[PDB]
Design an enzyme around this catalytic site. Sequence first.
Site, PDB file in Angstrom:
ATOM      1  N   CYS A   1       0.845  -1.184   0.000  1.00 15.53           N
ATOM      2  CA  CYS A   1       0.000   0.000   0.000  1.00 15.53           C
ATOM      3  C   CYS A   1       0.885   1.239   0.000  1.00 15.53           C
ATOM      4  CB  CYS A   1      -0.931  -0.029   1.215  1.00 15.53           C
ATOM      5  SG  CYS A   1      -1.730   1.524   1.660  1.00 15.53           S
TER       6      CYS A   1
ATOM      7  N   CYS B   1      -0.060   4.100   2.490  1.00 14.42           N
ATOM      8  CA  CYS B   1       0.387   3.703   3.824  1.00 14.42           C
ATOM      9  C   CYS B   1       1.856   4.045   4.033  1.00 14.42           C
ATOM     10  CB  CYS B   1       0.168   2.203   4.049  1.00 14.42           C
ATOM     11  SG  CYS B   1      -1.475   1.510   3.709  1.00 14.42           S
TER      12      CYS B   1
END
Length: 105
Positions: free
Chosen positions: A32, A35
């Site tokens: 991700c 993230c």
Amino acid sequence: MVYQVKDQEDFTKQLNEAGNKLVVIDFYATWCGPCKMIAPKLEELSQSMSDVVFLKVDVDECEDIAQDNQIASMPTFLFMKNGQKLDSLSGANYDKLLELVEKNK
Ligand SMILES: [Zn+2]
């Protein structure tokens, strides 16, 4: 430092040791990108704000924790306090995170 939960027992352990403090759980994955981008900001936040417990959960290392909490977006921030789920945040919006921290602490 944001503490990485290792398994469910570890997760329960951190929730008890938090006492009455707000706990913010960053459900994240290594694939991700957002993230990765918010990760350093989240670090400084945990260093600046000792009135809140910041945990993180790698959904791919703690699959059953992610499934028990019905995670569906990456990342998801869960807001827990005194054993209750109070709030959730989908996505890596750091300014909304700060607002939800203030709302729920
Ligand atoms: Zn896995």
